[PDB]
Amino acid sequence: PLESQYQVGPLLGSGGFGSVYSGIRVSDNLPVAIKHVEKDRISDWGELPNGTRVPMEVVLLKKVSSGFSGVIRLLDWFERPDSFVLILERPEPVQDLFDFITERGALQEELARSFFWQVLEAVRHCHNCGVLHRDIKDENILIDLNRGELKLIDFGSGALLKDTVYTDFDGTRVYSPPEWIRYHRYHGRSAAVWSLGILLYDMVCGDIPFEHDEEIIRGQVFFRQRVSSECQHLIRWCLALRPSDRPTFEEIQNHPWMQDVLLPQETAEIHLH
Ligand SMILES: COc1c(O)cc2oc(-c3ccc(O)cc3)cc(=O)c2c1O
């Protein structure tokens, strides 16, 4: 009985993902986020080990929600006649990376390094768990402003990770790779790496590098803010036009720009408090 266990608060947001509310679990006052998704708007379905028809999003969240992480944790879910309701952990205080960048503009490289590193660790965790997010971008990253810890949120466009080609995509187009634009084909890891290149550029420049399809497939990167050569190099590497010319996660994290990352707590003390 959903209505009983949780006390619902203000609507946090709504859009392609559904409607998400602030809430608190009655039993122990735990902060929570309560996400409603209408059934008729769910295209991708899956099955629990148990073998129950649920949204893929729930399957993926269960796969990654084991242990601690830079990934939002699913605490519970409920089915209703016309919708599924998901109960997720809610950090407090929090701000999404899109709003944070709106407010503060292009981020100092030290801060972008710390943030980008944590995104990489979260994405690796998803991939280790057999999950491909497919919509990595600033709007899908929450900052725990007190702990300086980032977390990945909306798995609504995700899929099981596989080594064969994907021919479907319903993530964010301006973060989608040229091979998707030209051929409607991509492989998971290398498409993720492209979206990570877009994200890093977004962090250090305060906006995404490409708006239009033709810019995406041309793949020419213009830097509108002062950005160090090492950071430009990593970004251009992530945005290589040929999928196989993109770095692996290991190569990103071994990149010279990625060395000597701040810890999350230092990150909050220096840049968020
Ligand atoms: C996994 O799917 C989602 C999603 O699609 C949107 C979300 O939004 C929030 C949130 C919290 C505070 C804000 O100020 C704004 C958003 C928390 C979530 O946990 C959350 C979520 O798990």
Swiss-Prot record:
One of its GO terms (cellular component) is cytosol. Its cofactor is Mg(2+). PROSITE patterns: PROTEIN_KINASE_ATP (PS00107), PROTEIN_KINASE_DOM (PS50011), PROTEIN_KINASE_ST (PS00108). It is an enzyme of class 2 (transferase). Expressed primarily in cells of the hematopoietic and germline lineages. Isoform 1 and isoform 2 are both expressed in prostate cancer cell lines. The active site is at residue 135. Keywords: Apoptosis, ATP-binding, Cell cycle, Cell membrane, Cytoplasm, Host-virus interaction, Kinase, Magnesium, Membrane, Metal-binding, Nucleotide-binding, Nucleus, Phosphoprotein, Proto-oncogene, Serine/threonine-protein kinase, Transferase, Ubl conjugation. One of its GO terms (molecular function) is ATP binding. GO terms for biological process: apoptotic process; cellular detoxification; cellular response to type II interferon; negative regulation of apoptotic process; negative regulation of DNA-binding transcription factor activity; negative regulation of innate immune response; positive regulation of brown fat cell differentiation; positive regulation of cardiac muscle cell proliferation. Proto-oncogene with serine/threonine kinase activity involved in cell survival and cell proliferation and thus providing a selective advantage in tumorigenesis. Exerts its oncogenic activity through: the regulation of MYC transcriptional activity, the regulation of cell cycle progression and by phosphorylation and inhibition of proapoptotic proteins (BAD, MAP3K5, FOXO3). Phosphorylation of MYC leads to an increase of MYC protein stability and thereby an increase of transcriptional activity. Belongs to the protein kinase superfamily. CAMK Ser/Thr protein kinase family. PIM subfamily. This is Serine/threonine-protein kinase pim-1. The lineage of its organism: Eukaryota, Metazoa, Chordata, Craniata, Vertebrata. The gene is PIM1.
